[PDB]
From Swiss-Prot, chain A:
An individual GO BP term: cytoplasmic translation
InterPro entries (alphabetical): Ribosomal_eL34 (IPR008195), Ribosomal_eL34_C_sf (IPR038562), Ribosomal_eL34_CS (IPR018065)
Protein name: Large ribosomal subunit protein eL34A
Source organism per UniProt: Saccharomyces cerevisiae (strain ATCC 204508 / S288c)
UniProt family annotation: Belongs to the eukaryotic ribosomal protein eL34 family.
Membrane spanning stretches: none
Entry's Gene Ontology molecular function annotations: structural constituent of ribosome
UniProtKB/Swiss-Prot annotation, chain B:
Listed name of the protein: Large ribosomal subunit protein eL38
Organism, scientific name: Saccharomyces cerevisiae (strain ATCC 204508 / S288c)
Domain of life: Eukaryota
Job description of the protein: Component of the ribosome, a large ribonucleoprotein complex responsible for the synthesis of proteins in the cell. The small ribosomal subunit (SSU) binds messenger RNAs (mRNAs) and translates the encoded message by selecting cognate aminoacyl-transfer RNA (tRNA) molecules. The large subunit (LSU) contains the ribosomal catalytic site termed the peptidyl transferase center (PTC), which catalyzes the formation of peptide bonds, thereby polymerizing the amino acids delivered by tRNAs into a polypeptide chain.
Alphabetical list of InterPro entries matching this protein: Ribosomal_eL38 (IPR002675), Ribosomal_eL38_sf (IPR038464)
Record's keyword terms, sorted: Cytoplasm, Ribonucleoprotein, Ribosomal protein
Cysteine pairs bridged by disulfides in the record: none
Subunit composition and interactions: Component of the large ribosomal subunit (LSU). Mature yeast ribosomes consist of a small (40S) and a large (60S) subunit. The 40S small subunit contains 1 molecule of ribosomal RNA (18S rRNA) and 33 different proteins (encoded by 57 genes). The large 60S subunit contains 3 rRNA molecules (25S, 5.8S and 5S rRNA) and 46 different proteins (encoded by 81 genes).
A Gene Ontology molecular function term of the record: structural constituent of ribosome
Ribonucleoprotein is among the record's keywords: yes
From Swiss-Prot, chain C:
Pfam families for this protein: Ribosomal_L7Ae
MF term (GO), any: RNA binding
Domain of life (superkingdom): Eukaryota
Family (UniProt): Belongs to the eukaryotic ribosomal protein eL30 family.
GO CC annotation: cytoplasm; cytosol; cytosolic large ribosomal subunit
Function text: Component of the ribosome, a large ribonucleoprotein complex responsible for the synthesis of proteins in the cell. The small ribosomal subunit (SSU) binds messenger RNAs (mRNAs) and translates the encoded message by selecting cognate aminoacyl-transfer RNA (tRNA) molecules. The large subunit (LSU) contains the ribosomal catalytic site termed the peptidyl transferase center (PTC), which catalyzes the formation of peptide bonds, thereby polymerizing the amino acids delivered by tRNAs into a polypeptide chain.
Additional detail: Present with 59300 molecules/cell in log phase SD medium.
The protein, known as: Large ribosomal subunit protein eL30
Keyword Ubl conjugation: yes
Residue location of crosslink Glycyl lysine isopeptide (Lys-Gly) (interchain with G-Cter in ubiquitin): 14, 45, 75
Gene this chain is encoded by: RPL30
InterPro entries: Ribosomal_eL30-like, Ribosomal_eL30-like_sf, Ribosomal_eL30_CS, Ribosomal_eL8/eL30/eS12/Gad45
GO biological process terms on file: cytoplasmic translation; negative regulation of mRNA splicing, via spliceosome; rRNA processing
Ribosomal protein recorded as keyword: yes
Swiss-Prot record, chain D:
WD repeat residues: 31-70, 79-119, 150-192, 195-233, 236-275, 279-318, 334-365
Protein family (similarity comment): Belongs to the WD repeat BOP1/ERB1 family.
Modified residues (Phosphoserine): 14
Gene from which the chain derives: ERB1
Name the record gives this protein: Ribosome biogenesis protein ERB1
Miscellaneous comment in the UniProt entry for this protein: Present with 2680 molecules/cell in log phase SD medium.
Protein task: Component of the NOP7 complex, which is required for maturation of the 25S and 5.8S ribosomal RNAs and formation of the 60S ribosome.
Residues of the full protein shown: 405 to 807 of 807
Impact when changing residue 66 to E: Weakens the interaction with YTM1, impairs pre-rRNA processing and leads to a deficiency in 60S ribosomal subunits. Disrupts the interaction with YTM1 and cannot sustain growth
Subcellular location field: Nucleus, Nucleolus; Nucleus, Nucleoplasm
Subunit structure and binding partners: Component of the NOP7 complex, composed of ERB1, NOP7 and YTM1. The complex is held together by ERB1, which interacts with NOP7 via its N-terminal domain and with YTM1 via a high-affinity interaction between the seven-bladed beta-propeller domains of the 2 proteins. The NOP7 complex associates with the 66S pre-ribosome. Also interacts with NOG1.
Amino acid sequence: AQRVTFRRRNPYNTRSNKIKVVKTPGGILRAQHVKKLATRPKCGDCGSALQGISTLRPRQYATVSKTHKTVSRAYGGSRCANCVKERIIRAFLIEEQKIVKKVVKEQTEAAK
Amino acid sequence: AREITDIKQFLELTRRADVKTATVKINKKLNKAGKPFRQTKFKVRGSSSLYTLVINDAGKAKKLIQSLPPTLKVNRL
Amino acid sequence: SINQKLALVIKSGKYTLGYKSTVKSLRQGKSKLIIIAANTPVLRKSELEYYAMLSKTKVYYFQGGNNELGTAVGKLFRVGVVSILEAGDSDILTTLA
Amino acid sequence: LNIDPNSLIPELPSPKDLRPFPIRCSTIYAGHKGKVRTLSIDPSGLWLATGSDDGTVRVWEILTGREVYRTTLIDDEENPDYHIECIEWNPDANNGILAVAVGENIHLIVPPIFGYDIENNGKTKIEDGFAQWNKPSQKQLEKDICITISCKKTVKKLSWHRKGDYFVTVQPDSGNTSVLIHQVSKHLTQSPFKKSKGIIMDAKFHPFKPQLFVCSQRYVRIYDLSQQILVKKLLPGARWLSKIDIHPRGDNLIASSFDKRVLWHDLDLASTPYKTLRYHEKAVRSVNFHKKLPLFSSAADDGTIHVFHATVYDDMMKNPMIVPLKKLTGHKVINSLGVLDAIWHPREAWLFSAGADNTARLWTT
Amino acid sequence: AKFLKAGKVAVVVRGRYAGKKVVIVKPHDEGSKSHPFGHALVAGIERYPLKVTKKHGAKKVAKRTKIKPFIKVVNYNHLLPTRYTLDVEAFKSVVSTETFEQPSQREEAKKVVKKAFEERHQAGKNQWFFSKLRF
RNA sequence: GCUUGUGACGGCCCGUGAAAAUCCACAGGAAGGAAUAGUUUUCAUGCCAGGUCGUACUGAGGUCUCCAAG
RNA sequence: GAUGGGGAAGCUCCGUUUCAAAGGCCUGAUUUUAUGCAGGCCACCAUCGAAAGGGAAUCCGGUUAAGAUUCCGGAACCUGGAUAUGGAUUCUUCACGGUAACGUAACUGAAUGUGGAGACGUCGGCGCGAGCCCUGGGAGGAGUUAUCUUUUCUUCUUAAC
């Protein structure tokens, strides 16, 4: 039934000042300051937690290898695979609508 | 602190020449539910972190203490 | 009415439902007439229109959502695209619809 | 670096003082219409079993090369969907049980070669037990099949225990249950692990102490079965791993690789390979230890087998020496495909090869 | 009409080669015991041949025209079929079901494929296939 | 059960919900990379270093705040 | 709240991007009447303002007359910087598997364009976890007892990483 104090100088219950009451090897309870939790990286096109990317503190990405920060596709570490799929489809058909419009344009010029 | 469940790995660490001392820890433990036995723990202060070696066997322990470099300071318990 | 024209075929002739199966049918060239709902995704709509342009298939845009196409075929679920592999006792091919 | 090239080759003992080792071929096995994908030798040392994509399991001798036996599994052979992949003799002393993996099912054939004592010992071991295990039908009774274990996906590899009670089977694209431990004595199909790390290529039991080495595409994972956990994890320097083999004393390990590597893992030294050697021209298809003598082979896809001498020092803390011996050649390449398998003779320094040339070969000292 | 054919250009949508253009060498309309789904056997090119100007000479030109290919069994569900077409006759007997699942038959597949694509890029034809799909 | 932490939901709004330092990622395709150590180290192991100021105690009609047994 | 400007006899006030020449980077065989520097890229604005907002990383045990997340023993982590070795980069030039969601010991990526974290209102019930509380068995100690009571109390712990 041990009561527990803050360890750092901030006496307030802020976002940064969270507390875990941990039992120490001295047989007594003491507070542990909880590190602010890491979030999932998100789809820039989708708005969804993209798979296969490590979830770390922003600064913590500098230490880890590139195979924990990127999946193997094009737009790998920034998009969804669904949002990549959708823009492969989109860029293809837009590029082919350009061809059809040139065919119609060349035909109308020959008509005049 | 890091577990190495790997015999020659420990012996590679002992001959680093940046290592001053070693320690052999002896424990009293029991298997499954039946019988008590004796566990050894081969620990070296590595270059950065402490590496440890649980050997549940007593004969492999008997061989390993013998196999250590004689110039190295060995600590019981 | 189109509902009368379709429900006859679904109880009489060979058909298919959904995107993947219609595209498989277009690859086989065994599709005769495709039916596209209004609320279908623009990328999938353009992909079906282009695939039908390749296979040389007549294209019919169904006026109304996929719910109304499920109702038209007489099924509880929703369907984005319906094909006609085999035309039934109706003259659906030679008609405007 | 002003130096001679000669002082870059490591000081290795000359192969002449490490005899015996096989030099030339003696027994050419000409009988197949399809490529000999797999081999197996009996523990006693006469009955050499083969398998091909002509749907025909043939059993040969070692000294003559005469076809003593034939069984045909698939009837529409050239239908490319499923072929005979891996065959294994029972390591148990004098019972004569042959496993055959053809596509989605494993057929345990006990042949009419032997007689009554050894044969009915094998037969009673099969019928004692009474993926599913089926009673063989009339057509299956003709093909000498004692039991068929049918699965959903294609079996590609097989390996027994030291006893002959358990046999492990590996199916790629089976997902979770890609490694299965079967037992004949109870007809029990156990899936020993609740997950599988990606795609698995191989799995082989340790010689004596109870642990299984599941060999994935990228990893070799040492799994204890008395604790049902993971123990060690090998990181091969290579990327894609064809075949594994364990030293008969259970100290060391070799990995073959589709990306041309062959890696000597010491299970006492590190998690990395002790010695990476990358000499082959094509994919290293099969690497196997000899059981008695300190020797191992390496059969790649270039129609070339390289034989190695490997001393292992048990008591002393001294790293194992590996020296090359001879480049065995002569195998024919059939559409970018060399030697599909290699297996040593149990007691002497002879080696059984199997190429794409529809022909197995025996090498001699 | 079964448009998904032996000389048909496609755009890969999924997995490591997403965005990369391919050609279906041999379709499989109703799958196999391995791959129990309507798939296709493709041979596309990963590292695109980079642009070459009059300033580049003798060694850079050799570097730019170098193409790196890839072979993969791919599902129809991850393929975007294209209106375009490509000649395929040089490497139809090179890639099959036996070609896949057992290297180094994939290696000698990749060499014939590498040759065919480099020999077709040089003597400038089929330029749309060797341009980068911008997305 | 009390304290606290976290997850998926459901309400309450036209009330649509601080900023910046810092860190990571994607698209892009410039440039570079071999025959007595080619190019690349987001892989593993190894080396060195981290200044100034506050830091005692009290803090109980009469400033703020945390922990809370049966 | 300076600077540019504009007021004010003036002490100084207005104003915060304004009609300011507000600067910091790249390209090059050395720049063709012979050794005098040319071309391009970007377009907002100093600064102060939080010991309760955002923020890299430290715990346990021990130690004094009075100091502790600071000292000691042990065990850690973060950040920055040189560099050294092994591994990889495959027959030589930026790796592959999986239908796919994705997986991996790595697996170069300039200008420029973009995305995520930072990064966010309030309540309600429900799920799960940790601590506290209640309790059964057992291994020790203190107590009360004429009576009843296998009784009452206490110890049985596990930090960062």
